[PDB]
Design a protein around this ligand. Structure first.
Ligand SMILES: *[C@@H]1O[C@H](CO)[C@@H](O)[C@H](O)[C@H]1NC(C)=O
Ligand SMILES: *[C@@H]1O[C@H](CO)[C@@H](O)[C@H](O)[C@H]1NC(C)=O
Ligand SMILES: *[C@@H]1O[C@H](CO)[C@@H](O)[C@H](O)[C@H]1NC(C)=O
Ligand SMILES: *[C@@H]1O[C@H](CO)[C@@H](O)[C@H](O)[C@H]1NC(C)=O
Ligand SMILES: *[C@@H]1O[C@H](CO)[C@@H](O)[C@H](O)[C@H]1NC(C)=O
Ligand SMILES: *[C@@H]1O[C@H](CO)[C@@H](O)[C@H](O)[C@H]1NC(C)=O
Ligand SMILES: *[C@@H]1O[C@H](CO)[C@@H](O)[C@H](O)[C@H]1NC(C)=O
Ligand SMILES: *[C@@H]1O[C@H](CO)[C@@H](O)[C@H](O)[C@H]1NC(C)=O
Ligand SMILES: [Ca+2]
Ligand SMILES: [Ca+2]
Ligand SMILES: [Ca+2]
Ligand SMILES: [Ca+2]
Lengths: 615, 699, 105, 180
């Protein structure tokens, strides 16, 4: 080896970490600024710079305060912006950027999915390209509350009116059309390609489509319309096409550069070096807050695919999308130049008067100014947007019909009595539902009704009784968790709308494993009784039953009661007796058929509440 | 509103303005198009008087050929329906081959019997010319020739609108010879006038031209009453265009328009016919209905075939699966019910990975590259301190971009604060003592894998696999979900927060995130994570591209559905460009992607003589899927130690031989016996105060 | 790409240039436009196409046919960079299709 | 004004700042180039200790290979002199094969006996690294390795600046045996 060169101390950064295993200030004091500094006075770190205790940092709509080397942040769910970037790239609500070129019409956002009663549905159609091209454009159809607003050719087309036209509003500002479709839904459109949908927290967990289910989780955003998560965005998008007869995207091989750059060098590098504008000095301060790499990829892809001629719009619009994101994060960037993507507003200043120069381009101007058509101020998602902005003296107001500033006067215009039996006591309960084919869908429906009425007869809350519902169909499909804060009526609705799997096998040992290691992972209510209904209607292959006794004994060691409720001739009576042998309180119910649940319900709930203590 | 042109029957045409005539073409002819400035051209192709295809040209840059028998060719290249390109949509709407040009303002169709159809938007009023004639309500002027003059002869007009090509030059077509009439057949043509259902349309469409055409086609007939059907069908379609759908004409007459197997012909079929795998968006379908074929009531379409609503399958990964089928996604399963999948919604084991020049995968599948040079906290249980894994990174070549893990360190506080160090070259030390493997010590187990990689296990809930060259795979059971911390993330099923830092906030930059987890203050804080090391060594860029492209080749297409190849492609190119030896790192990256595929249960035979063959020691044989449980003679000495491990690729002894310490393959009669940690040779005997033993067959 | 180049270079035949085409032949400049636009395949600045069209417009202006071919969506040009100022803004500079060449200063 | 680097004789090198040493390479090595952001790379190719070509890369989109015996290949395709493309000019100036890069700020040359030459503009002062060393008048610091550390051994430095390819992976070069 030809080498030819040359307990532990703690630092505010590495205090909580291990000691370097590759080889002194007083206790309670820490190295900082090459001096010993007391604990509880170490600063907090963000974006590579330090913050003294008591200082604050602004993160989206949330605020964080530095206390004891830990940021302590507000927990507001900020408004989320889905965005179509370029001609073939999408950015979901949770931040997943993915590629999907398609010719057809697709669901961009929709709440008419799942059990939720829908209210709005936004469709996006690609016209003039699927492989990004110069002459391309996108059509948006906004089917909100029965009304319909179509966005096309850079103009709004209200093809049917809404039920509440007061909630509806359209604002034109800078390059963008801003539509308010409600108190919690808005759309921002650059009039050419970059559609953006903004949702407030009230729509969380409810929407779907190409923008994904807004839940703060990225991994599940490629959930197909048929509820299956896809590894490839092409299949996901194909699953979200509105018209079945239309063509599917073909999953072209994933070349390192698109067509017309795959075999065209000196175009690939021109595209690369021109898209590196995202890394230049003007954007260099935004790159600390936002990652330019996804937008760099979009820029390269669209610029290869487009090879535009007269309008350089593909490149310029991608850069403008990145600048729009930066402006949302407070980093307004002046990226336009006379030699790079120039924009002029002088067409609005030349006039029959000659020339009067109220309109300027501005890097970004306040989005929703007051006008003769919008005299009252109105809340709108984006604070500052790029484009032509009319600047005129105090007290003077813009008229959108004149595109001219004019005087303000010149404008042209719980529940106990649900049953006699009500169970107000400390209990944690799990319903394990056999999803095998040994129950037909009709039988599974009556089994669900049995669960639902039992939930009617329990005092559902984090106090008193907590309920969880788990279907097992060789995998443990949980529909309700004990941590869910939803109201009892909503929980009963969710239980009533549990779907039917109908698997040929439903591993019972596997659901015992699931409840043991994932449901009762931590006993957060040691004073409360913990009970599970292993209601079951099927055999399992012997090879899958080998760890059954281990799991039931582990559940006993956690003092989780398991009450097997065998149903029908195909119930695995052997596993039931094995459960009974573990503890006397694990007494079994064996039923002729699921309709006998209606008869057994009263004593089942009586037993469950006998096995639970009061406050 | 919109015009309609039709070429129907054997040799008949109907213009936009209603002029109707016969033409038996022998070449291709312009049916319609921009007549001064021809932005598009609709071209009907004939052969021996019969129609064979309906072509469209968008102005010499795009051409499409829809043949009568379902075949579609773009240029001379064949393509399959449905097809969409450059504003043209080919679809099997209502069982009839559609070719929609909404942007260009036209819709074309071929029915099951070969009758062409063209609908042309109002924007082409008085601006089109071709066999379909001009489009101005005056019908007498439809026979304008391409020379700009009217003619009383349909054939002069049609031949004037012929178009030749480089493999077909048009001959002058002329009327064919004919014989001309039979009363019983003539009654069928008179149906147009006598029947009540057709009588609805008389105020809109005069039946007399159709009756004359029907009479002369009966003269041309070579069959039964069906010879009158083209005229009746065209009359019904003309009436539907004018506004009156003649719902009952198919029942009164003896005709039955051709439809594909199992589908019924029906008037006013909604274009938005219900396929199973279709969103229930009925508000979008504002279009008018059309005549065509439909599946019988209660059935649904599925890849063109009609199926029962309950019979029809789910779709995943481009494949269709019958109802009741189950698909696995790691530890989860998804059941096809109705058209949907019912999925298991449970947490599966998390796998963090360090697999090259500082390429990482968090427990939540966030891929990133960091290239920092320090000891970094890779993964730790910040909630209960069950374990703590630290990696030591060094520059692994001359390039600044080549940084890879040299050694791994694992603290196990529950095991009396044991400090295992996994070293370069796959050695292991414990509390500084170099140790000999396999090591069994309480819950801790360490042993060589068939790949010579050290595999560490601690209980059931933690496992590690260290190859000694720089690849580390850490597998946690769901017990640690949410409890984890470090570069590998918090293991909570979300990529979004994997750049969390001990400060409690998520760093938007990988550099700051990684610097936050460095253990030693004197280490350099990484300023920028430079991607594309190929810039520093341009010589390697061609090899990098052309070699790492194999990850997207058909060699791995079997896996692209299971695992996305893009992160592994990025990592491969980075490694090949930055490594000391590009061949070794090429093999490393390809093996990493293949290992991911195998983790998803897909095995790819990717090794070949030209790339990355395992040259197995001595007489051992390479297997792509071999079982490790019964390879070593220790397995003979400890047969009751349970082993259920899945197969893996590596070097194994032939089926009849076990493997000893030297790596030599030996029959079980020649294995030594391991007893109390001592190695006894075959046929050895010993007796003690308490026991008498002897070694035979490795036991 | 050939046809996009062709149809975009046909701007020389459009209405704004249609009166100049009586005085000057656009075909040579159309050929130059097509050639440069294929060869360039420009990215950020559309300068090849715009400069060819500007050359034709310059010839037209020499022949007295001043043509207003610029648009916000086609080869836009802005002079506002000269109007913004340390004092704020004053709008003395304007784009003009063509202005007298050798003004007094 | 402008720097000069030379690789001359059998196995000798002269840096921009005057440091001079011997190296018998067996692979291709970086002679000069943008050292943080490498917009271009000048690469000297050796074989059995002797020089065989002077290659230039403009950042992975264009490469040119000027061999000692007059042959020029762009990529693997042979081309004939004079040649001009993408700002690079190959010319037989004064009977010696020139490779001018005025736009990029460098001029390279091979004389009739195989001695390489590189002239690098002032804009690369203190911003280049390679066998020609950095370009700052201090000559003692020319032996910076690609790892960013000085070394007293010319071979450590040179081998640190080796560049491998998909058909040639660099072996560790070492001083040859000699009599003196
Ligand atoms: C964080 O802030 C909240 C709200 O002021 C406060 O209740 C809490 O004690 C603070 N500290 C922690 C560790 O949550
Ligand atoms: C752009 O608008 C902001 C106000 O939001 C103003 O401060 C700035 O001066 C404006 N720029 C121009 C050029 O008018
Ligand atoms: C039409 O049918 C023939 C005969 O089966 C077949 O060979 C051909 O591919 C089909 N399509 C065309 C365009 O001829
Ligand atoms: C149609 O075009 C012809 C030829 O340009 C013209 O004479 C006529 O007025 C136009 N309109 C109608 C209704 O024919
Ligand atoms: C090991 O097990 C495999 C599979 O069970 C079997 O084929 C083989 O004969 C066994 N013995 C050896 C020495 O491989
Ligand atoms: C351009 O200048 C001429 C005078 O040379 C004037 O007539 C014309 O109105 C000007 N155009 C604009 C837009 O200022
Ligand atoms: C150098 O000389 C050899 C021998 O004549 C010749 O074959 C070769 O083409 C020349 N050029 C190169 C690059 O080897
Ligand atoms: C050259 O670069 C080094 C490293 O950035 C710097 O320390 C030095 O000041 C620069 N100038 C000179 C004259 O060395
Ligand atoms: Ca989500
Ligand atoms: Ca007419
Ligand atoms: Ca996470
Ligand atoms: Ca120097």
């Amino acid at each position: 080896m030809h080498c030819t060169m040359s307990e532990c101390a703690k630092t505010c950064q590495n205090y909580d970490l291990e000691c370097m295993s590759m080889g002194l200030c007083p206790p309670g004091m820490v190295r900082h600024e090459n001096r010993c500094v007391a604990l509880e006075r170490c600063p907090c770190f963000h974006q590579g710079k330090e913050y003294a205790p008591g200082e604050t940092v602004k993160i989206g709509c949330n605020t964080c305060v530095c206390r004891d080397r830990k940021w302590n942040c507000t927990d507001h769910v900020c408004d989320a912006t889905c965005s179509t970037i370029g001609m073939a790239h999408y950015l979901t609500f949770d931040g997943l950027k993915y590629l999907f070129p398609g010719e057809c019409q697709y669901v961009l956002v929709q709440d008419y999915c799942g059990s939720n009663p829908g209210t709005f549905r936004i469709l996006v159609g690609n016209k003039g390209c699927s492989h990004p091209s110069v002459k391309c454009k996108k059509r948006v159809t906004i089917l909100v509350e029965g009304g319909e607003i179509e966005l096309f050719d850079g103009e709004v087309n209200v093809k049917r009116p809404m039920k509440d036209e007061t909630h509806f509003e359209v604002v034109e500002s800078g390059r963008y059309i801003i539509l308010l479709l409600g108190k919690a839904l808005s759309v921002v459109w650059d009039r050419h390609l970059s559609i953006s949908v903004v949702l407030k927290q009230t729509y969380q967990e409810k929407v779907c489509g190409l923008c994904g289910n807004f839940d703060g989780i990225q991994n599940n955003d490629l959930t197909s319309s048929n509820l299956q998560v896809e590894e490839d965005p092409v299949d996901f998008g194909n699953s979200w096409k509105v018209s079945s007869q239309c063509a599917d995207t073909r999953k072209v091989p994933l070349d390192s550069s698109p067509a017309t750059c795959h075999n065209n060098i000196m175009k690939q590098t021109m595209v690369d070096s021109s898209c590196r504008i995202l890394t230049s000095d003007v954007f260099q301060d935004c790159n600390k807050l936002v990652d330019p790499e996804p937008y760099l990829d979009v820029c390269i892809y669209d610029t290869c695919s487009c090879e535009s001629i007269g309008d350089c719009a593909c490149f310029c619009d991608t850069i403008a999308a990145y600048a729009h994101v930066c402006a949302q994060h407070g980093k307004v960037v002046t990226w336009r130049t006379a030699t790079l993507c120039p924009q002029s507003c002088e067409e609005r200043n030349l006039r029959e008067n000659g020339y009067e120069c109220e309109w300027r381009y501005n890097s970004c101007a306040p989005a929703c100014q007051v006008t003769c058509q919008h005299p009252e101020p109105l809340a709108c998602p984006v604070q500052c947007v790029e484009g032509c902005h009319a600047h005129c003296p105090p007290g003077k107001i813009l008229d959108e019909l004149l595109q001219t500033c004019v005087d303000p006067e010149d404008c042209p215009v719980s529940e106990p009595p649900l049953h006699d039996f009500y169970c107000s006591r400390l209990l944690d309960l799990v319903f394990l539902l056999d999803g095998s084919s040994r129950l037909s869908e009709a039988e599974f429906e009556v089994l669900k009704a049995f669960v639902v009425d039992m939930m009617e007869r329990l005092r559902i809350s984090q106090k008193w009784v907590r309920v969880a519902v788990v279907e097992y169909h060789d995998g443990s499909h949980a529909y309700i968790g004990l941590k869910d804060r939803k109201r009892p009526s909503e929980l009963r609705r969710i239980a009533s709308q549990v779907k039917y799997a109908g698997s040929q096998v439903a591993s019972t040992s596997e659901v015992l494993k699931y409840t043991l290691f994932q449901i009762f992972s931590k006993i957060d209510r040691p004073e409360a009784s913990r009970i599970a209904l292993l209601l079951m209607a099927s055999q399992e292959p012997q090879r899958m039953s080998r760890n059954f006794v281990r799991y039931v004994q582990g559940l006993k060691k956690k003092k989780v009661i398991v009450i097997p409720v065998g149903i029908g001739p195909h119930a695995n009576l052997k596993q039931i007796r094995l459960i009974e042998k573990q503890a006397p309180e694990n007494k079994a119910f064996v039923l002729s058929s699921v309709d006998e649940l209606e008869q057994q319900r009263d004593e089942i709930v009586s037993y469950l509440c006998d096995l639970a203590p009061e406050a | 509103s919109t015009a309609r042109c039709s070429l129907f029957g054997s040799d008949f045409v109907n213009t936009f303005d209603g002029s109707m005539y016969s033409f038996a073409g022998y070449c291709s002819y312009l049916l319609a198009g921009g007549c001064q400035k021809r932005s598009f051209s609709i071209i009907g192709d004939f052969q021996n008087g019969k129609r064979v295809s309906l072509s469209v040209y968008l102005g010499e840059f795009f051409d499409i050929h829809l043949f009568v028998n379902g075949t579609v060719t773009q240029g001379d290249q064949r393509v399959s329906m449905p097809y969409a390109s450059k504003g043209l949509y080919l679809e099997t709407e209502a069982g009839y081959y559609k070719l929609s040009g909404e942007a260009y303002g036209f819709v074309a169709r071929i029915d099951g019997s070969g009758n062409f159809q063209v609908l042309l938007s109002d924007r082409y009023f008085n601006k089109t010319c071709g066999l379909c004639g001009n489009f101005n309500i005056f019908a007498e002027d439809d026979f304008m020739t391409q020379e700009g003059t009217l003619t009383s002869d349909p054939y002069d007009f049609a031949n004037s609108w012929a178009l030749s090509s480089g493999e077909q030059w048009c001959e002058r077509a002329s009327p064919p010879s004919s014989s001309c009439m039979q009363k019983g057949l003539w009654e069928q043509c008179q149906l147009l006038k006598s029947t009540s259902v057709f009588a609805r349309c008389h105020p809109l469409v005069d039946p007399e031209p159709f009756v004359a055409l029907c009479e002369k086609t009966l003269c041309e007939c070579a069959g039964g009453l069906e010879c009158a059907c083209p005229a009746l069908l065209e009359y019904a379609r003309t009436c539907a265009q004018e506004g009156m759908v003649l719902y009952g004409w198919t029942d009164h007459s003896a005709c039955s328009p051709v439809c594909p197997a199992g589908m019924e012909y029906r008037q006013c079929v909604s274009p938005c016919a219900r396929t199973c795998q279709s969103l229930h968006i009925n508000e979008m379908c504002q279009e008018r209905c059309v005549d065509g074929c439909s599946c019988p009531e209660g059935q649904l379409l599925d890849e063109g075939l009609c199926v029962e609503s309950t019979e029809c399958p789910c779709v995943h990964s481009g494949k269709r699966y019958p109802p009741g089928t189950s698909l696995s996604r790691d530890c989860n399963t998804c059941i096809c019910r109705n058209s949907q999948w019912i999925c298991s919604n449970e947490e599966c084991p998390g796998e963090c990975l360090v697999t090259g020049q500082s390429h990482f995968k968090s427990f939540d599948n966030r891929y990133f590259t960091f290239s920092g040079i320090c000891q970094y906290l890779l993964a730790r249980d910040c909630q209960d301190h069950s374990f703590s894994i630290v990696i030591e990174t060094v520059q692994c070549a001359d390039d600044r971009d080549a940084v890879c893990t040299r050694s791994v360190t694992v603290r196990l506080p529950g095991l009396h604060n044991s400090l295992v160090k996994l070293k370069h070259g796959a050695g292991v030390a414990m509390d500084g003592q170099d140790v000999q493997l396999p090591l069994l010590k309480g819950d801790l187990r360490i042993q060589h894998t068939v790949t010579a990689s050290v595999r560490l296990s601690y209980g059931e809930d933690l496992q590690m696999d260290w190859d000694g060259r720089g690849r580390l795979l850490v597998k946690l059971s769901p017990v640690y979900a949410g409890k984890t911390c470090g570069l590998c993330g918090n293991y909570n099923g979300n990529q979004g927060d994997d750049f969390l830092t001990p400060s409690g906030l998520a760093e938007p930059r990988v550099e700051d995130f990684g610097n936050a987890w460095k253990l030693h203050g004197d280490c350099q804080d990484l300023q920028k994570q430079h991607s594309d090391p190929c810039a520093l060594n341009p010589r390697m860029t061609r090899f990098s591209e052309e070699a790492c492209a194999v990850l997207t080749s058909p060699t791995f297409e079997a896996c692209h559905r299971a695992v996305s190849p893009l992160p592994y492609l990025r990592n491969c190119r980075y490694d090949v460009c930055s490594c000391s030896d590009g061949r070794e790192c090429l093999c490393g990256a390809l093996a990493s992607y293949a290992a991911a595929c195998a983790g998803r249960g897909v095995r790819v035979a990717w090794r070949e003589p030209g790339r990355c063959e395992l040259n197995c020691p001595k007489g051992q044989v390479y297997l792509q899927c071999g079982t490790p449980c019964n390879l070593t003679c220790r397995s003979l000495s400890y047969p009751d130690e349970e082993c259920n491990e899945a197969c893996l690729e590596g070097c194994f002894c032939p089926p009849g031989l076990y493997m000893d310490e030297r790596g030599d393959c030996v029959p079980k009669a020649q294995c030594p016996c391991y007893y109390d940690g001592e190695i006894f040779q075959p046929e050895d005997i010993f007796s003690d105060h308490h026991t008498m033993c002897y070694c035979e067959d490795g036991f």
